[PDB]
């Protein structure tokens, strides 16, 4: 007996990201690491699993077992 | 007997992120680490799992077991 | 017998983040650590799981078991 | 017998964050730690789980068991 | 027999955070610790779990069991 | 028989935080500790769990069992 | 038989915090402790749990069992 | 007895990302690490699996078992 | 008894990504690492599998078993 | 008893990516690594398989077993 | 009893990618690595198989067993 | 006097221009003028009656993109002398 | 006097231009003028009656992209003297 | 006197321009003028009657993008002398 | 006298410009003029009657983006002498 | 006399400009003029009657974005001599 | 005499400008002029009657963004001589 | 005489400007002019009657953003000679 | 004579400016002019009657953002000679 | 003679300015002019009657943000000669 | 003669300015002009009658933010000759 | 002759200024001009009658923020010759 007349739904949504860079100097030297200087939009609905990285930006993982 | 007439719903939503950089000097030297200097929008609805990083930005993980 | 006529709902939402940087000098030297100097918007609805980091920004994790 | 006519609801919402930096000098040297100098907006609705960090910004975790 | 006609509700909401920095010098040297000098807005509705940090900013955790 | 016509409700809300810093010199040297010099707005509705830190800012935790 | 016509309610709300710093010199040296020199607004509605810190700012915890 | 008349649904969607760079100098030297300076939009609906990275940007993974 | 009359559905969709670069100098030297400076739009609906990277951008993986 | 009259469906779709580069100098020297400076749109519906990279852009994989 | 009258369906589709480069200087020297500076649109519906790369762009794979 | 020069290089480009006027670029843009999109309707019984005498009647789903220069533009026009 | 020069190079390009005027570029653009798109309808019984005497009647799903210069543009026009 | 120069380089670019005028760029932009989008309707019984005598009637879902220069623009016009 | 120079570099760029005038950039922008969006309706019985004599009647869901220069713009116009 | 110079560098950029005038940038912006959005309605019985004689009547959900220069703009106009 | 210089550097940038005039930037901005948004309604029985003689009547949900230069702007206008 | 210089550096930037005039920045801003937002209504029985003779009547939910230069702006206007 | 200099540094920036004029910044600001927001109503029976003869009547929920330069601005105007 | 200098530093910044004029900053500000917000009403029976002859009547929930320069501003105006 | 200098430092900043004029800052401020907020009402029976002849009547919940320069501002105006 | 200097420091800042004029700062401030806030009312029976002949009547909940320069400001004005 359910009805959907014109309904909307947003689950795990990235919407409307605006970015402007004008005349920006930028100098990076990197040795064995992560350097992030840009736009990163991640939209997910379901992430299941033990010990799992669902969204990583600028990540360094060096584990011993 | 449910009815949805024009209804809206937002669950786990990133909406309307604006960023401007003008004439910004920026100098990074990095050795084995994480340096983040940008925009990062993450939208998720469900993340399940033991010991899981759902959203990491500028993360250094060096564990011993 | 439920009715939704024009209803709205926001659960776990990041909305309207504005950031401006103008002529900002910035110098970073980093050795094995996390340095975050940018925008990070995270929207989540459900995060379940034992010992899980739901949202990390500038995180250093070095554990021994 | 419930009715929602034009109703609104905000649960776990970050709304309207504005930040301006103009001509701000900033110098960081970091060794094995967390330094955060940016905007971080986190919106969550439900976080369940024993011993879990729901929102960390500038976090250093070095535990022995 | 419940009716919601134009009702509003805010549960766990961060709304309207404004920050301006103009010509602010800032120098940080950090060794194995947490230094936070930025905006951090966290909105949560429910956090359950024994021994869990619901919102940490500038946190140093070094425990022995 | 309940009716909500134009009602409002705020439970666990941070609203309207304004901060301005102009020409403020600031020098920090930190060794293994927490130094916080920024804005931090935290809004939560429910936090349950034994021995859990619901909101920490500038926290140093070094416990022995 | 309850009616809410235009009613308001604020439970656990932080509203209208304004802070200005102009030309303020500030020098911090910190060794293994917590130093807080910024704005921190925390709004919570319910915090339950034995031995739990509901809101900590500039906290040093070094316990032996 | 379900009906969908004009309904919409967005689950795991990245929508409307705009980025402009004008006259921006950028210099990168990188040795064995990850440097990201561009736009990255990721939309996913379901990611299941133990120990799996659902979305990585600027990731360095060097593990020993 | 289900009916879909004019309904829409978006599951794992990347929509409307715009990027402009004008007169941007860019110099990269890279030795054995990943440097990403372009647009990357990834849309996926289902990714299952243990220890699988669902979306990697600027990834360095050097593991020992 | 299902009917689809004018319905739409998008599952794993990349739609509407626009990119313009005008007068952009770009110099790359690369030794044994991955450098990506272009547009890459990937749309997938199902990816199953243990230890499989579903979408890689700027990837360096050098594993020992 | 199913009917499809004018229905549409898109599963694993890349649609509408536009790219313009005008007067862009570009110089690449590459030794044993992958350099990608062009458009790459990949649309797939099903990819199954253990340890298989479903979509690689700018990939370097040098494994020892 | 626009002069460009590269010397003793392994990959050199020397570009010079005297006077430039760039044009318009439409890259992925969209435009809609007089468009009807997405009209869903579920009715058990439908009835539509029009009784017109000496006039102009326009019904149904109509989209019009009409341009005129030296004349009267209209959608439904009735004129009598 | 536009001059470009490359010397002692392994891959040299020397480009010079005196005067340039770029044009228009339509790359992937779309345009719609008077378009009807996506009209779904589910009706058990449909009935449509038109009774017209000496007039102009336009019904149904119609899309018109009409351009006129020195004349009266219309969709349905009725005129009597 | 615009002069650019690169020397003793491994990857050199030397760009010089005298006078520049960039143009317009539409990159992913959208425009809507007179658009109807998303009209859902669920009715058990529908009835629509129009009785027009010597006039102009416009009903239904209509979208009009109308431009005129030296004439009277309208949607429904009735004139009698 | 605009002069740029790079020397003894491994990756050098030398850019010089004399006079510049940038243009407009529309990157992901949207514009709506006379738009109807999202009109949901659930009715058990619907009835619509129009009885027009010598006049102009406009009903239903209408969106108009109308531009005129030297003429009278209107949506429904009735004039008698 | 604008001069830029880089020397003995591993990654050098030397940029010089004499006179600059930047333009407008619309990056992700939105604009709405005469827009109706989100009109939900649930009615068991609906009835709408219009009885017009020699006048102009505009009803329903209408959005108008109307621009005029040297003429009278209106939505419903009735004039008699 | 604007001069910039970098020497003996591993990553040097030397930028010089003589005269600059930045423009406007619209980054994520929104604008609404004459907009109706979110009109919910639940009625068991609805009845709407209009009886117009020689005048102008505008009802329903209407949004108008109207600009005029040398003419009388209005929404409903009735004039008699 | 604006001079900037960096020497013996590992990451140097040398920026010089002679004269600067920054512009306007709209970053995430919003503007509303003549907007109706959020009109909820629950009525069991609704009745609306309009009886207009030779005048101008505007009812319902209306939002108008009206600009005029050399003309009389109004919403409902009635004039008789 | 504005001079900036950095020497013997590992991360140096040398910035010099001669004359500066910053502009306006709208970052997250909001503006409302003539706005109706949040009008809830619960009525069992509603009745609205308008009987207008030769005048101007404006009722309902209306929001107007009206600007005029050389003309009389009004919402409801009635004039007789 | 503005001079700045940094020497023998590991992270040096040398900033010099000759003359500065900062502008306006709107960061998170709000403005309301002619706004109606939050009008709740619960009535069992509602009745509204307007009987207007040759005058101007404005009722209901109205918000007006009206600006005029060389004309008479009003909300309801009635004038007779 | 403004001079700043830092020497033999590990994190040095050397800032010099000659003449400064800061501007206005609106950070989180609010402004209300002609605003109605929060009008709750519970009535079992409501009746409102207006009988207007040749005059101007304004009733209901109205908020007006009206600015005039060289004209008579008013809310309800009646004038007879 | 403003001089600042730091030497042999691990974190040094050297700031010098010649002439300064700070501006205005609005940080979290609020302003209200002509505002009605919080009008609660519980009535079993309500009756409101207005009988106006040739005059100006303003009733109900009204808030006005009115500014005039060279004209007569008023809320209700009646004038006869």
Author numbering:
A (entry chain R), B (entry chain P), C (entry chain N), D (entry chain L), E (entry chain Z), F (entry chain V), ...: 36 to 100
L (entry chain E), M (entry chain I), N (entry chain G), O (entry chain S), P (entry chain Q), Q (entry chain O), ...: 14 to 94
Task: Give verbatim lines from the article.
Multiple system atrophy (MSA) is a progressive neurodegenerative disease characterized by accumulation of α‐synuclein cross‐β amyloid filaments in the brain. Previous structural studies of these filaments by cryo‐electron microscopy (cryo‐EM) revealed three discrete folds distinct from α‐synuclein filaments associated with other neurodegenerative diseases. The 3.3‐Å resolution structure of the Type I2 filament reveals a fold consisting of two asymmetric protofilaments, one of which adopts a novel structure that is chimeric between two previously reported protofilaments. These results further define MSA‐specific folds of α‐synuclein filaments and have implications for designing MSA diagnostics and therapeutics.
Here, we use cryo‐EM to identify a novel, low‐populated MSA filament subtype (designated Type I2) in addition to a predominant class comprising MSA Type II2 filaments.
